[PDB]
């Protein structure tokens, strides 16, 4: 299905299965995440998350 | 109030954070009873009262 839905759409659409241990990641994984310090604004965030 | 006490208006946003708007009289006019005087309430038609 993501093999239907990737080469023939306009727009990204995903065909999947919850893990197990739902709400809790997968294996090799993990989830980042990019902080404001000084007061740096949304866009050189943003930039710095590019 | 507002004049000797202070007065919370709204919340403005420093850098990127939320701070408050405190609107108050200057030091000079409200440290001793005399100063009292220097207030003026404007009335119904358009005249200053002490």
Same mark, same amino acid.
């Given at each position: 299905?993501?093999?239907?839905?990737?080469? $023939?759409? &306009?727009?990204?659409?995903?065909?999947?299965?919850?893990?197990?241990?739902?709400?809790?990641?997968? @294996?090799?994984?993990?989830?980042?995440?990019? $902080?404001?310090?000084?007061?740096?604004?949304?866009?050189?965030?943003?930039?710095?998350?590019? | 109030? @507002?004049? =000797?006490?202070?007065?919370?208006?709204?919340?403005?946003?420093?850098?990127?954070?939320?701070?408050?708007?405190?609107?108050?009289?200057?030091?000079?006019?409200?440290?001793?009873?005399? &100063? $009292?005087?220097? =207030?003026?309430?404007? @009335?119904?038609?358009?005249?200053?009262?002490?």
């Amino acid at each position: 299905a993501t093999r239907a839905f990737s080469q $023939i759409k &306009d727009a990204m659409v995903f065909a999947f299965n919850l893990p197990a241990i739902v709400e809790l990641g997968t @294996a090799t994984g993990f989830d980042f995440e990019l $902080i404001d310090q000084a007061g740096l604004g949304h866009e050189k965030l943003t930039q710095a998350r590019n | 109030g @507002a004049a =000797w006490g202070g007065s919370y208006v709204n919340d403005f946003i420093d850098r990127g954070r939320v701070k408050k708007v405190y609107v108050m009289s200057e030091a000079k006019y409200r440290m001793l009873p005399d &100063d $009292i005087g220097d =207030w003026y309430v404007r @009335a119904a038609d358009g005249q200053m009262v002490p």
